[PDB]
Design a protein around this ligand. Structure first.
Ligand SMILES: COc1cc(C)c(C(=O)NS(=O)(=O)c2cccc3cccnc23)cc1-c1ccc(C#CCO)s1
Ligand SMILES: [Zn+2]
Ligand SMILES: [Zn+2]
Length: 585
């Protein structure tokens, strides 16, 4: 294994030859440990609190989920506990028959996904444009430096020779240029899956890439119209740690569709940084803090360019395999058989494949499946054998499905169908309210002024007005935040890193105008384009549903907050200063 990773470890070792040592008390059991060096400890035991949101959500000061979210340990201690609890495991190799059906399905799926689209290399100027639009970090400074691109070119030449010198995953500007350079090179070779929307619903059938949270519920409602069994949405326990060497070799098959110069670079990413990887992780010691150098041949590196798309691919494949087992196409005997009949798998894929993909909504490790009947609930042999063991359920207990699409969990949400006062139906996204408030109360970074804090608060408020307006407490808190923050202050930072967020709330445009654009004008499931002219006609969940989903409506403390909210707004305004404010209450 040293022939692939040796050069990276040699460069790390030489850069820290003063403090480099082999810590024999290292806690790694399934990862190869190469050595350690001294570092300055990074992270925090607690997250910073957004005072603007906190002051305008007083009843949630006494809420346990709101307190828990404010914690999250990122210190070397936090890094180590997460590592031990999840990442330091080995997935048993799938059986020979399971490997065979996965290989057949992966070959058919890649050909289906590439039926209209051709892979291509992504560029420096594409990466540059993405970095600029995201910052509008030190990444914008690097991208502007010609020496950054010269470091990139030197690494690419090693990749072209089948070698890697500086692409290290992390759990001086030279080390930062090497990390961003590593990410650019991955973007160059595999970025096309995202940039050219290979996992869009039109291209992939099961996929939802580019859809946006406001479309997911409508897609689940459409799947519910397909004849079949219940809708299943099983969670995998730590999906990224369950990506096997066999999964990685099946994902690598996309390189067969590439032009020769592209194939060479993508083969370098797969073989040197996915199937072999060098990882840095911080660890507390009695003496201080060390950086450990570790390696392994499987699992998925969570913070990589190709992660979302490749997880979506492998999950689509795994769910098709589970549907084949449910239909009796794959038997227990087939999974143990290296010599299983390839023809019946091929025949099912060619005649039923696409129809079975349309029965699913797949976003990375998140899946919703509506099989042809409920035999799927007990079809667990291939799923468990592929390593995709379901979270917090005995291995052989049947999956429980839903017969109502509104009860289905997907991407941390569930979806409600609302009837507007004018008779039109809306399908809206929702999650436990404490989660929404708890997140909005967390600020991103230290040494952030009242201005930056208030602008992030406004970004959360405006996200609530656009996606979660149907929650009484969030509409009231949103109105309060937007009344407390100067009208012309532009929302900053980001409320989420979800691929499903399109950030339409990152504006100073009227939120009702934006609401009409998203929910009426652009909404393909809204035939009648009549605009809503007042928030009074923007619906809420039924009161009982709002309460079931965490609303404090009906509580005295909530009634007191609603009554006295102009006082808290004025208190925020007085600390912000003599600025232009608008009264949204
Ligand atoms: C599928 O959509 C989402 C899923 C999640 C997970 C988040 C999200 O960040 N949640 S979070 O902060 O509470 C959170 C943070 C970190 C890890 C988590 C793990 C599990 C659950 N939450 C986590 C946000 C959105 C969106 C919010 C608005 C959206 C829109 C639109 C239209 O353009 S899309
Ligand atoms: Zn490299
Ligand atoms: Zn709900």
């Amino acid at each position: 294994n040293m022939d692939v990773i040796g050069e990276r470890i040699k460069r790390i070792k030489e850069e820290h030859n003063s403090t480099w040592h082999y810590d024999d008390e290292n806690p790694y059991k399934t990862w190869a440990y190469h050595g350690s060096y001294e570092v300055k400890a990074t992270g925090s035991a607690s997250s910073m609190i957004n005072g603007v949101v906190k002051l305008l959500t007083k009843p949630w000061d006494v809420v346990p989920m709101v307190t828990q979210m404010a914690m999250t340990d990122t210190t070397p201690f936090g890094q180590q506990r997460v590592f031990k609890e999840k990442v330091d495991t080995r997935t048993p190799r799938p059986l020979p028959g399971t490997r065979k059906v996965m290989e057949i399905t992966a070959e058919w799926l890649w050909r289906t996904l590439g039926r209209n689209k051709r892979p291509r290399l992504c560029t420096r100027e594409e990466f540059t444009k993405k970095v600029r639009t995201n910052a509008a970090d030190s990444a914008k400074a690097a991208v502007e430096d010609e020496e950054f691109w010269k470091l990139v070119d030197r690494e690419r030449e090693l990749h072209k020779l089948g070698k890697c010198g500086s692409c290290v995953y992390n759990m001086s500007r030279a080390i930062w240029y090497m990390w961003l350079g590593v990410r650019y090179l991955e973007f160059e070779a595999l970025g096309f899956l995202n940039e050219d929307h290979w996992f869009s619903r039109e291209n992939s059938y099961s996929g939802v890439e580019g859809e946006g949270l406001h479309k997911l519920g409508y897609i689940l409602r459409d799947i519910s119209k397909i004849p079949g069994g219940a809708m299943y949405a099983d969670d995998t326990a730590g999906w990224d740690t369950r990506i096997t060497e066999d999964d990685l070799h099946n994902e690598e098959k996309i390189i067969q569709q590439m032009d020769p110069e592209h194939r060479q670079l993508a083969n370098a990413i797969f073989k040197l940084t996915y199937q072999n990887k060098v990882v840095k992780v911080q660890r507390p010691t009695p003496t201080g803090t060390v950086m450990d150098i570790i390696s392994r041949k499987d699992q998925r590196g969570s913070g990589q360019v190709g992660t979302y798309g490749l997880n979506t691919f492998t999950n689509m494949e795994a769910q098709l395999v589970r549907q084949m087992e449910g239909e009796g196409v794959l038997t227990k005997a087939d999974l143990e058989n290296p010599h299983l009949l390839e023809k019946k798998i091929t025949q099912w894929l060619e005649t039923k494949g696409v129809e079975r993909l349309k029965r699913m909504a797949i976003s990375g490790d998140d899946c919703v499946v509506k099989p042809i009947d409920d035999r799927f609930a007990n079809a667990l042999l291939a799923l468990n054998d592929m390593g995709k063991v379901r979270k917090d359920i005995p291995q052989w207990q049947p999956s429980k499905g839903w017969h109502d699409w509104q009860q289905v969990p997907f991407c941390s949400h569930h979806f409600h169908e609302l009837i507007m006062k004018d008779g039109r139906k809306l399908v809206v996204p929702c999650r436990p309210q404490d989660e929404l408030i708890g997140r909005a109360r967390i600020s991103q970074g230290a040494g952030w002024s009242l201005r930056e804090t208030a602008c992030l608060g406004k970004a959360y408020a405006q996200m609530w007005s656009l996606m979660y307006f149907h929650r009484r407490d969030l509409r009231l808190a949103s109105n309060a935040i937007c009344s407390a923050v100067p009208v012309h202050w532009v929302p900053t930072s980001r409320t989420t890193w979800s691929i499903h967020a399109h950030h339409q709330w990152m504006t100073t445009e009227d939120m009702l105008t934006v609401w009409n654009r998203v929910w009426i004008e652009e909404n393909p499931w809204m035939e009648d384009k009549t605009p809503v002219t007042t928030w009074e006609n923007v619906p809420y969940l039924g009161k009982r549903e709002d309460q079931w989903c965490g609303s404090l409506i009906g509580l005295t403390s909530r009634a007191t907050w609603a009554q006295n909210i102009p006082t808290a707004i004025q208190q925020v305004r007085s600390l912000i200063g003599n600025e232009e404010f608008l009264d949204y209450m």
